[PDB]
Amino acid sequence: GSVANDENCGICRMAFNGCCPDCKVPGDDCPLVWGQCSHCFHMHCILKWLHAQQVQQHCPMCRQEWKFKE
Ligand SMILES: [Zn+2]
Ligand SMILES: [Zn+2]
Ligand SMILES: [Zn+2]
């Protein structure tokens, strides 16, 4: 669990210090992407979330215009 840990994604609830679920990559070019806010999701993941669904663009969590923050 009931703890509030933001160290885990929301789409695949994985540790930012790990490799994507659908990606068996060792750890070379598979980092993560952050948003306007603490929001931190895996590039490929999030990217696909918005790159697959054009209907809604608003962040998958906040109602703010999804921003590909650095
Ligand atoms: Zn990956
Ligand atoms: Zn966000
Ligand atoms: Zn993800």
From Swiss-Prot:
Outcome of swapping H42S: Greatly reduces autoubiquitination activity; in isoform 1
GO CC annotation: anaphase-promoting complex; cytosol; nucleolus; nucleoplasm; nucleus
Tissue spec. comment: Expressed at high levels in skeletal muscle and heart; in moderate levels in brain, kidney, and liver; and at low levels in colon, thymus, spleen, small intestine, placenta, lung and peripheral blood leukocyte.
Residues the record lists as binding Zn(2+) 2: C37, H39, C59, C62
Pathway: Protein modification; protein ubiquitination
Subcellular location: Cytoplasm; Nucleus
Top-level division of the source organism's lineage: Eukaryota
Keyword terms of this UniProt record: Cell cycle, Cell division, Cytoplasm, Metal-binding, Mitosis, Nucleus, Ubl conjugation, Ubl conjugation pathway, Zinc, Zinc-finger
Annotated residues for binding of Zn(2+) 1: C9, C12, H42, C45
Zinc finger (RING-type): 20-63
Impact after mutating C59S: Greatly reduces autoubiquitination activity; in isoform 1
A GO MF label: zinc ion binding
Result, substituting C45S: Greatly reduces autoubiquitination activity; in isoform 1
Outcome recorded upon mutating C20S: Slightly reduces autoubiquitination activity; in isoform 1
Subunit structure: The mammalian APC/C is composed at least of 14 distinct subunits ANAPC1, ANAPC2, CDC27/APC3, ANAPC4, ANAPC5, CDC16/APC6, ANAPC7, CDC23/APC8, ANAPC10, ANAPC11, CDC26/APC12, ANAPC13, ANAPC15 and ANAPC16 that assemble into a complex of at least 19 chains with a combined molecular mass of around 1.2 MDa; APC/C interacts with FZR1 and FBXO5. Interacts with the cullin domain of ANAPC2. Interacts with UBE2D2.
Domain notes: The RING-type zinc finger domain coordinates an additional third zinc ion.
Record family assignment: Belongs to the RING-box family.
Protein name per its UniProtKB record: Anaphase-promoting complex subunit 11
Organism: Homo sapiens (Human)
